[PDB]
């Protein structure tokens, strides 16, 4: 009715404060709202997609506008290695005088924040040189956000709402996505690179007024049409190019030298355009696959129904998977989040391994922040994929449709899967903790020579097979006169070998026993998080303790204290438990990356190689040592520009600590406390005339777990980000 949860009649009649909390918390759960049909659900999701896309482009336009208005892009272009990039200007009426002088840094004269997101290098590579270019990009993205908001409004109109058959058109949507949204966009980016970014790297000034009359190549469409495509690769940029200017430059637009530009320590811009062109052609061909309207093409139902091994090896094969995926939005979303989590972990690895933006791998602060950023986001997406698979099992899985399916057999032998994940996790934890404690006791007792240090020969063999030639394995690419080393010897090999065998890059960092131990720790974390998530997903439909768990839904508090006790029995509680393990393993990964790069950037990799084998070495050489510039941001003798990072460090500590409130103390204590406070307010004079509308009650059990988990996570992020930024900023190496 007129009450706030208009979508839930059950919540609107709640006389307590639980109504507001649950109405806020269940606003986006479009499947369970009152009187919801499938078509209306799909239309609302389409409109929400448009609104979210507009939010993304508004955020990017805001970044562009703030760098254009309050930034030092003009000064940073002229000297990228010595000028600090600027995020935006600071307005604070709470500042003292010394805070105003302390935050006044860079070339500007106002208090200011130094950008650690690397947007300066990215825009500098793609041809931005002035503040007007950034402002025009901000205007374009503002107009795009306006257009997307209008489109979202338009597709909820009665004559423009698409039908349910339009949404479930898998072949047409995948054809158009794979061809257009991937290949045509990659082709357009290759065109932008060749027309603007490559000439800007060579000193030419190409903008909207002269791009249509300036030839990107001296010949121009003659090597392409005649078939002499190798003319575009001749005369590349020499190894004296000096980015942004024209001395030692070339006239090539599509090359595959491989390796790094010698000055910017990033990949060649002509390699990237060639890469994008190849990906464009491949994606257009791949989008030419599924039957839409012209006879040719596949049917996705027939491919899935055909793939049955001959004699019952996988049951009934993939029969019925087409009907389950199309009719369940939770399975599609789970597949999307799993793939996106793999993708953003891949970008996290490859942007430090193979930097593409000019004059990165020398800032080190953007280099740390981007990696930690993308790894934490990867962990979040990975947990969400399994959470939505559990939701799909709870309220979207049809057992009769999936009879003897490849999906039902997963539930058939779920006990074997959970038990073997248990065995792997227990084995890894036992052994890597035993090795770490052994090294701790051996170093503590004055005998570091008694440590168990396993040399990581498999990954070192992989590095040698990629071309690294200090391990002395002499195999494949590391050994000349080999088939792999000869076949590519005149396309991309010399640049790759001169980039992999130098000590200034992050390509295939030299690894020792500490790398072995911490990789085993990472495998432990991955296997245990997978254990919790897979067990929750597979036991979401029921177990021995609760055979009818599907009747109670995905998220419910418990099943009472009977038959032993049923605390944390739902699949939502399995998500809640696996969130801690994801945070733990991402913290392990980021600690390993940050300490290894802190020792490599300072030219002191021996410190990591000697102190990473035992836990006290970590504790006293990474965390205790690198906190000194952070915690000294403000003290009894004054303050500097890292005072905000010290304050945020303590802030994240306090939020992480007050999560333990909701995680350890449970409802009953607080409900009785609330009842005493209710008596207090009702029975005091003057103040009893002020009467509440909603009866105050304690937070519910699932709500309390969510609030404590959100506190734990926010405190986790807000205590790791200031450390990983200020410790790198406080050392410059």
């Amino acid at each position: 009715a007129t009450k706030f949860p208009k979508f839930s009649q059950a919540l609107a009649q709640d006389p307590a404060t639980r109504r507001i909390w649950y109405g806020i918390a269940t606003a986006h759960d479009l499947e369970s709202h009152d009187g919801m049909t499938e078509e209306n659900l799909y239309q609302k999701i389409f409109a929400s997609h448009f609104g979210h896309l507009a939010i993304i482009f508004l955020w990017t336009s805001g970044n562009l506008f703030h760098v254009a208005w309050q930034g030092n892009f003009q000064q940073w272009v002229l000297n990228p290695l010595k000028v600090k990039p600027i995020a935006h200007a600071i307005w604070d009426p709470h500042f003292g005088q010394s805070a105003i002088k302390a935050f006044t840094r860079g070339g500007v004269s106002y208090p200011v924040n130094i950008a650690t997101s690397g947007v300066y290098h990215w825009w500098y590579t793609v041809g931005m040189r002035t503040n007007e270019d950034l402002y025009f990009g901000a205007l374009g993205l503002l107009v795009l956000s306006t257009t997307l908001l209008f489109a979202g409004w338009l597709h909820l109109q009665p004559k423009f709402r698409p039908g349910i058959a339009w949404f479930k058109n898998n072949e047409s949507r995948l054809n158009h996505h794979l061809s257009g949204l991937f290949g045509v966009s990659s082709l357009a980016w290759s065109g932008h690179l060749i027309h603007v970014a490559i000439p800007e790297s060579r000193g030419q000034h190409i903008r909207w007024n002269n791009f249509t009359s300036t030839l990107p190549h001296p010949e121009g469409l003659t090597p392409f049409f005649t078939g002499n495509w190798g003319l575009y690769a001749e005369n590349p940029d020499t190894a004296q190019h000096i980015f942004g200017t024209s001395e030692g430059a070339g006239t090539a637009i599509l090359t595959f030298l491989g390796g790094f530009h010698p000055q910017t320590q990033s990949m060649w811009l002509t390699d990237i355009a060639h890469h994008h062109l190849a990906i464009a052609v491949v994606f257009i061909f791949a989008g030419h696959m599924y039957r839409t309207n012209w006879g040719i093409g596949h049917s996705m139902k027939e491919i899935l129904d055909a793939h049955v091994p001959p004699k019952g090896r996988l049951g009934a094969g993939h029969r019925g998977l087409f009907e389950t995926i199309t009719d369940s939005l939770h399975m599609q979303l789970g597949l999307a989040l799993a793939s996106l989590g793999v993708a953003t972990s891949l970008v996290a690895q490859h942007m430090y391994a193979l930097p593409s933006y000019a004059f990165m791998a020398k800032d080190y602060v953007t280099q740390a922040a981007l990696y930690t950023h993308h790894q934490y986001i990867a962990g979040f997406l990975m947990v969400g994929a399994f959470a939505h698979g559990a939701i799909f099992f709870v309220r979207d899985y049809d057992p009769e449709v999936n009879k003897d399916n490849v999906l039902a057999r997963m539930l058939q032998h779920k006990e074997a899967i959970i038990s073997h994940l248990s065995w792997v996790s227990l084995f890894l934890g036992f052994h890597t903790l035993g090795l770490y404690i052994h090294n701790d006791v051996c170093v503590a007792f004055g005998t570091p020579e008694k440590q168990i240090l396993f040399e990581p020969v498999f990954a070192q063999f992989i590095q040698a097979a990629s071309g690294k030639a200090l391990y002395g394995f002499d195999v494949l690419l590391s050994s000349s006169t080999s088939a792999a080393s000869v076949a590519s010897s005149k396309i991309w090999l010399p640049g790759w070998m001169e980039a992999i065998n130098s000590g200034k890059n992050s390509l295939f960092l030299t690894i020792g026993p500490g790398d072995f131990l911490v990789h085993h720790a990472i495998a432990l974390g991955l296997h245990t998080t997978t254990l919790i998530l897979v067990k929750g997903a597979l036991d979401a439909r029921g177990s021995k303790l609760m055979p009818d768990k599907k009747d109670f839904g995905y998220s419910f508090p418990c099943d009472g204290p009977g038959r032993g006790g049923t605390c944390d029995i739902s699949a939502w509680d399995a998500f809640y438990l696996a969130m801690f393990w994801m945070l733990n393993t991402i913290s392990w990964v980021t600690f390993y990356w940050h300490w290894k790069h802190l020792t490599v950037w300072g030219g002191n990799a021996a410190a990591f190689n000697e102190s990473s084998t035992y836990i006290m070495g970590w504790l006293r050489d990474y965390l205790w040592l690198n906190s000194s510039p952070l915690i000294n941001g403000y003290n009894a003798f004054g303050m500097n520009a890292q005072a905000v990072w010290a304050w945020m460090f303590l802030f994240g500590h306090l939020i992480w600590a007050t999560g333990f409130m909701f995680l350890i103390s449970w409802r009953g204590y607080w409900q009785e406390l609330i009842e005493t406070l209710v008596w207090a307010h009702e029975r005091t004079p003057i103040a009893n005339l002020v009467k509440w509308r909603d009866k105050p009650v304690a937070l519910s059990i699932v709500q309390a777990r969510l609030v404590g988990l959100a506190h734990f996570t926010v405190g986790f992020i807000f205590t790791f980000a200031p450390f990983v930024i200020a410790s790198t900023t406080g050392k410059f190496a």
Binding site: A47, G51, A54, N131, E132, L139, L142, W153, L156
Partner: peptide
Amino acid sequence: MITDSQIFFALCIALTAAVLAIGLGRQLYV
């Protein structure tokens, strides 16, 4: 250097985007 007229033009575009955002949010409605 970004002039004041350019900033006010960007503010006008953002205001139009705000009115359309209100329209979309009230088309999904509560």
